[PDB]
């Protein structure tokens, strides 16, 4: 088979940058005598399934945006956008069909935006979950950029980093911003020995913490 | 619109065997060389087998020749693909294609889950306010396997400022959250409620975010 070769793994520019990417084939996609070049450019959203965007290697399908573009030919061949919007985030994995075929390990395209604080919300356990042995206490931190933070829980006044457990969720297609849910699972019992619980966000978006706790069941 | 369902995927033991289908439509599919795509949880794409239109040729890749045989079924418009002592490396998402420039499209995915584990449906909990201009709603779809679980806020009428996190593995068991925001006037006037579904378990479940107690 023929392995196909995709750099950088990762790519990151801001709405309306012209951006290319490399696709490398172990050997010429080329036929001699057309010059065509048997390559491919599949483009695959966050929960969506690929879509070709080109093919033979500079040829957009129909109803693809014209920023879109590609080159190269023989083994070597390039995807560019010449301006890179907030809906173009996706991998885009190049393929080849010379031989069978082969896929690339594809790049991720990121959009850089304008820094972004998060909106945090603390949720104590539903009384439904309790009522088995559990208490999951939520934390929302929604919206947000970049996406390095910081999430620490302080029940009572002290920190817990035992029971909890991070979801970042990918890039968004619209405003281009993170979300990320902090969530502290401790037992039904382990969870009423104490009544402060607090979820501590500091994100480079400000010095000050974002602190959203509550009291057990106070209401 | 062309049309490309694959099912019969989902968990199954290693070393176990299972029989995807493609149902085709939209297209003279007997006209057509499909193909079946796979993705690793990792996110790698990686082509697993093609048969040419008549069926009179199949092509693999070196290493899936032998555990997969793709065979098709022009009078049923249905693409089939066997997978046989099924290891773990073999979980992925498996996608029917069709790579023709004037049918170019791939459906939406069967998940198949290689593990000894076993199907337990999901647990879905509430996320209520606590003790504003926006209302910020949760759902906890917890101790599920395996993948996936679908969540949708008031039957999906509230696309969006909603947001689903992916599930965290622990004890081989999927736990993951969905958040969803509408503005303060709405909720609790009018109601808002997540509609979880898991399909390994056929389990359709929904629950109203009600304003907690007191």
């Known amino acids: 088979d023929i392995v196909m070769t995709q750099s950088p793994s990762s790519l990151a520019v801001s709405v309306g940058e012209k951006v290319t990417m490399s696709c490398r084939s172990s050997q010429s996609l080329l036929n001699t005598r057309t010059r065509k070049s048997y390559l491919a450019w599949f483009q695959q959203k966050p929960g969506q399934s690929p879509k070709m965007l080109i093919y033979?290697?500079?040829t957009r399908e129909s109803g693809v945006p014209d920023r879109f573009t590609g080159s190269g030919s023989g083994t070597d061949f390039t995807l560019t956008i010449s301006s890179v919007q907030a809906e173009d985030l996706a991998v885009y994995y190049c393929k080849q069909s010379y031989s069978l075929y082969t896929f690339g390990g594809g790049t991720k395209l990121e959009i850089k935006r304008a820094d972004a604080a998060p909106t945090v919300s603390i949720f104590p356990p539903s009384s439904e979950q309790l009522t088995s042995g559990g208490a999951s206490v939520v934390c929302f931190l929604n919206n947000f950029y970049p996406k390095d933070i910081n999430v620490k829980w302080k029940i009572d006044g002290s920190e817990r980093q035992n029971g909890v457990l991070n979801s970042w969720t990918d890039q968004d297609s619209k405003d281009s911003t993170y979300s990320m849910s902090s969530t502290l699972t401790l037992t039904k019992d382990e969870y009423e020995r104490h009544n402060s619980y607090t979820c501590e966000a500091t994100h480079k978006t400000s010095t000050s913490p974002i602190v959203k706790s509550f009291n057990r069941n106070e209401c | 619109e062309v049309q490309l369902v694959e099912s019969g995927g989902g968990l199954v033991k290693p070393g176990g065997s299972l029989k995807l289908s493609c149902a085709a439509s939209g297209f003279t599919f007997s006209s057509y060389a499909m193909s079946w795509v796979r993705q690793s949880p990792e996110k790698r794409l990686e082509w697993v087998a093609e048969?040419?239109?008549?069926?009179?040729?199949?092509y693999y890749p070196d290493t899936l020749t032998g555990r997969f045989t793709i065979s098709r079924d022009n009078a049923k418009n249905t693409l089939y693909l066997e997978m046989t002592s099924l290891r773990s490396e073999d979980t992925a998402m498996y996608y029917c294609?069709?790579?023709?420039?004037?049918?170019?499209?791939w459906g939406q995915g069967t998940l198949v889950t290689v593990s000894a584990a076993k199907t337990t449906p999901p647990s879905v909990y509430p996320l209520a306010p606590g003790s504003n201009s926006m209302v910020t709603l949760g759902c906890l779809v917890k101790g599920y396997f395996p993948e996936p679980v679908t969540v949708t806020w008031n039957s999906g009428s509230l696309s969006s400022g909603v947001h689903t996190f992916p599930a965290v593995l622990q004890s081989d068991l999927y736990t993951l959250s969905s958040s969803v925001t509408v503005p303060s006037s709405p909720r609790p006037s009018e109601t808002v409620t997540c509609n979880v579904a898991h399909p390994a378990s056929s389990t359709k479940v929904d629950k109203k975010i009600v304003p907690r107690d007191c």
């Open positions: 294609a069709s790579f023709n420039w004037d049918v170019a499209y």
């Open positions: 048969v040419s239109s008549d069926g009179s040729y199949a």
């Open positions: 033979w290697a500079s």
